[PDB]
Design a binder for this molecule. Sequence first.
Ligand SMILES: [Zn+2]
Length: 209
Amino acid sequence: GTILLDLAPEDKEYQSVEEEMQSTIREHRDGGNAGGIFNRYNVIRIQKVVNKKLRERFCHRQKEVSEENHNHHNERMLFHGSPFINAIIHKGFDERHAYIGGMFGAGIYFAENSSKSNQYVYGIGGGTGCPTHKDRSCYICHRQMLFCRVTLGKSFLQFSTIKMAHAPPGHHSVIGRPSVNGLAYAEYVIYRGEQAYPEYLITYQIMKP
Ligand SMILES: [Zn+2]
């Protein structure tokens, strides 16, 4: 029920996504332990995920949020790395498989920075790395991540560690903005899988300095 459409490297969308990916690369305080050491990706292919049902759910929920947020659905293109990408592009986002170990409670997380999402491609905290060379800084294996469209709506800006099962009353998402001696980069949390849609599937690599 899911068809993948390879975008040509000469198309505007391809280079737009790529530019949105390689420009949001930042140095993390872990010294590149989980995501590995890199400064720019090696994009193999960018494929659009097509599934009318998931889009129907997404647009329905988007309409609900819009109706409950000043007729203005805050759609934002955000990154997402997970060891279960295929399950996402086939079945859609699911809050039943949310990040319980997250800082803002068992919800679905999204990073504005591509590297931060790369930190979760091979699992939580980098996991155990690639399935071939057992290295989470492997420059050989083809990694993947998701450039998704997330519906935030009325966002709730919490900076400290506040766990929760759902979004605050009158809200739809929880945004954690960077704080000194706190979190380094912004995080975006949604507690409904209907508020995200894996628009772009990015197959890439990391480059050794
Ligand atoms: Zn490898």
